[PDB]
Amino acid sequence: SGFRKMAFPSGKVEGCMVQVTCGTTTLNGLWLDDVVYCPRHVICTSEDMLNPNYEDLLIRKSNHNFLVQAGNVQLRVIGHSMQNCVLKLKVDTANPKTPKYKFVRIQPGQTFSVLACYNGSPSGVYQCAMRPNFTIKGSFLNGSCGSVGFNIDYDCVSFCYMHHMELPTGVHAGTDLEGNFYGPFVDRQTAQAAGTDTTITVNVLAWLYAAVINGDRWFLNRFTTTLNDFNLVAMKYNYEPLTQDHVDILGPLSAQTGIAVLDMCASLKELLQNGMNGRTILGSALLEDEFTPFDVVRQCSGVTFQ
Amino acid sequence: SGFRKMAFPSGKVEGCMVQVTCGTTTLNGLWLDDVVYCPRHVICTSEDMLNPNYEDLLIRKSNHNFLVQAGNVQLRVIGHSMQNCVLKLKVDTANPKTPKYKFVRIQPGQTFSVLACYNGSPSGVYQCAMRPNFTIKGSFLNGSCGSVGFNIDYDCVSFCYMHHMELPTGVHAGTDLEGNFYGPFVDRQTAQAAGTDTTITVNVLAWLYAAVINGDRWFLNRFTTTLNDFNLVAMKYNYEPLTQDHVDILGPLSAQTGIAVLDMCASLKELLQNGMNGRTILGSALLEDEFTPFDVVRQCSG
Ligand SMILES: O=C(N[C@H]1CCSc2ccc(F)cc21)Nn1cnc2ccccc21
Numbered sequence: 001s002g003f004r005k006m007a008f009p010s011g012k013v014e015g016c017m018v019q020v021t022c023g024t025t026t027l028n029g030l031w032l033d034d035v036v037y038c039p040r041h042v043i044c045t046s047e048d049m050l051n052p053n054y055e056d057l058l059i060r061k062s063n064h065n066f067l068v069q070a071g072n073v074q075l076r077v078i079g080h081s082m083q084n085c086v087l088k089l090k091v092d093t094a095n096p097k098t099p100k101y102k103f104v105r106i107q108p109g110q111t112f113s114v115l116a117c118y119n120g121s122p123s124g125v126y127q128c129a130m131r132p133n134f135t136i137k138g139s140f141l142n143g144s145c146g147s148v149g150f151n152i153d154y155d156c157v158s159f160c161y162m163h164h165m166e167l168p169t170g171v172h173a174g175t176d177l178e179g180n181f182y183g184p185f186v187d188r189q190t191a192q193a194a195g196t197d198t199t200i201t202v203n204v205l206a207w208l209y210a211a212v213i214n215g216d217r218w219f220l221n222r223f224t225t226t227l228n229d230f231n232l233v234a235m236k237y238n239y240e241p242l243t244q245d246h247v248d249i250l251g252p253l254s255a256q257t258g259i260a261v262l263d264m265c266a267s268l269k270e271l272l273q274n275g276m277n278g279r280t281i282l283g284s285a286l287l288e289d290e291f292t293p294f295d296v297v298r299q300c301s302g303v304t305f306q
Numbered sequence: 307s308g309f310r311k312m313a314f315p316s317g318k319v320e321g322c323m324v325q326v327t328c329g330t331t332t333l334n335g336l337w338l339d340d341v342v343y344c345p346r347h348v349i350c351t352s353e354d355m356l357n358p359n360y361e362d363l364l365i366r367k368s369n370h371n372f373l374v375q376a377g378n379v380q381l382r383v384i385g386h387s388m389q390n391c392v393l394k395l396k397v398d399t400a401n402p403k404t405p406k407y408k409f410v411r412i413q414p415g416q417t418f419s420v421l422a423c424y425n426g427s428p429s430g431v432y433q434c435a436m437r438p439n440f441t442i443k444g445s446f447l448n449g450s451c452g453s454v455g456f457n458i459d460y461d462c463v464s465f466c467y468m469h470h471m472e473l474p475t476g477v478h479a480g481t482d483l484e485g486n487f488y489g490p491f492v493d494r495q496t497a498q499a500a501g502t503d504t505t506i507t508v509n510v511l512a513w514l515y516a517a518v519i520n521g522d523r524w525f526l527n528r529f530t531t532t533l534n535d536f537n538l539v540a541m542k543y544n545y546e547p548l549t550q551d552h553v554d555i556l557g558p559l560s561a562q563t564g565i566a567v568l569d570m571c572a573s574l575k576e577l578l579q580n581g582m583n584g585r586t587i588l589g590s591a592l593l594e595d596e597f598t599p600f601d602v603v604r605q606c607s608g
């Protein structure tokens with residue numbers, strides 16, 4: 001029992017982190033087979049960032065302008081290209097520690113582990129969700145660009161995030177590993193701000209199901225709701241709409257606990273109305289929305305504590 | 307910016323996790339050089355676990371009764387002995403991935419990363435504190451025994467915890483790597499319970515400093531206090547006493563933010579007396595006590 005924000009073991013990713021330097025700018029790169037992936041803004045100076053012309057900046061670079069360092073060893077760059085907002089540096093050595101991997105672009109609400117890295121050296125690992133407003137609430141300092149987010153379902157690492165920037169509200173924006181930004185964000189210093197964020201309803205429900213599994217029933221009530229009435233109330237608390245897809249996805253947790261999804265929705269409605277009245281749910285005084293239905297099944301017993 | 311419960315990268319520990327099987331019991335072991343460390347209760351059945359005589363149970367075992375699996379490979383056990391509550395299985399192969407390491411015993415209040423494992427396969431990493439009552443609020447299912455806790459202090463892994471049991475309140479108990487329990491717990495089926503826990507004051511103050519560093523300032527006030535007056539308030543709210551050692555340890559954060567420790571204690575005093583009045587700190591409605599001063603500096607500066 002217990003319930004923790006748990007990250008995937010980071011070792012398969014640690015073996016892929018390198019340092020990339022262009023000019024005076026150093027950040028992190030991901031070394032998979034014979035390619036190093038990093039944010040294209042590594043090629044920018046101070047001035048460049050207001051209105052960078054990346055094509056023009058890049059055409060002026062040779063391979064040997066890119067210094068790649070893997071632990072103690074310099075890797076030799078033998079090619080470069082730009083894909084969307086990532087630079088792909090072809091190097092002369094395949095990474096012998098390359099894991100089984102794939103690139104996946106995630107949807108808002110999905111969770112992943114972040115390996116925070118500085119100078120190509122990993123510092124820490126923590127669990128994050130893609131917010132409805134396409135930001136992440138990370139922990140990142142200057143030098144963290146090129147840090148990656150991932151899941152490891154089985155022995156296969158699914159890379160889903162590369163860190164590019166911190167927005168003015170202190171939350172974080174980045175790309176998939178094909179270099180496409182999550183959200184409306186650009187790798188340019190302009191006025192861009194996170195949209196108003198909402199709570200990830202499907203995840204809160206999953207976590208309520210986790211609390212029941214772990215032996216906790218105080219917040220249930222005798223009521224049900226229609227989906228549309230649930231969504232009319234939810235939206236007033238800045239909760240994301242719940243779709244029929246979300247109801248379907250919660251089906252297994254519904255079976256394990258014997259509580260229908262719209263009955264759990266009725267419980268959530270009442271929690272939003274009443275608060276917790278000095279109680280906690282799985283150690284929290286707030287409703288948690290960074291555990292997915294999949295994450296609850298991964299972590300929780302399939303025997304509920306009745 | 308941002309502040310997260312952050313674990314150490316687990317790679318150096320992942321390469322040391324193995325599966326140990328004795329009879330019908332399978333759990334996790336730690337393979338360092340040519341020794342595999344695991345909980346001695348691996349040798350017990352259900353009935354044995356009521357009143358085990360470990361010395362007697364062990365002397366009846368042969369090396370070949372211990373099946374050790376490192377991924378796909380069987381290791382051959384060539385010796386066995388016990389140190390306190392851990393079993394040491396001498397194997398025929400040194401672990402080529404053995405990191406630089408030490409065994410260290412931690413103090414209540416200190417934090418560490420846990421690599422949770424099942425069948426010798428690492429499943430997840432999370433950050434824990436050793437509670438004042440010597441339990442940890444882990445997340446563990448059946449099969450997790452022998453899962454380990456660690457810190458990393460350069461390239462050196464400091465192993466501090468091995469998981470042995472879950473208590474009735476759903477919290478967890480274990481040993482250091484020399485097999486000495488944290489807390490007044492024994493490896494047998496008896497009635498055992500977590501004692502009443504307290505809040506780790508020095509850690510709450512550290513986290514308040516983290517909040518200020520991250521721009522969350524609403525709880526700062528014009529008042530200061532003394533150690534003695536603050537400690538009267540702590541005791542009332544089931545908080546650990548704050549010592550001069552604790553004040554000294556918070557010194558750096560005090561300098562960086564320009565809030566003296568006893569100034570921050572005046573803030574904490576007011577939070578304990580008045581609550582948060584609908585507000586949150588670093589996204590929390592509760593006061594967090596599982597970040598040490600070192601953890602805050604590490605994350606908010608390195
Ligand atoms: O935001 C960062 N770079 C800026 C520079 C100028 S405006 C800008 C615009 C686009 C872009 F892709 C990057 C940037 N780096 N970065 C990432 N996490 C950080 C955390 C703390 C401080 C800086 C941090």
Ligand SMILES: O=C(N[C@H]1CCSc2ccc(F)cc21)Nn1cnc2ccccc21
Pocket residue numbers: 001347355446447448449450451470471472473492493494495496
């Ligand atoms: O507590 C556990 N084993 C028992 C067997 C019977 S009484 C007992 C007594 C002492 C001891 F050291 C261990 C044990 N295993 N264990 C560890 N984390 C778990 C999480 C969920 C369920 C069981 C979990």
Ligand code: NA
Pocket residue numbers: 526527528529530568569570572573
């Ligand atoms: Na004050």
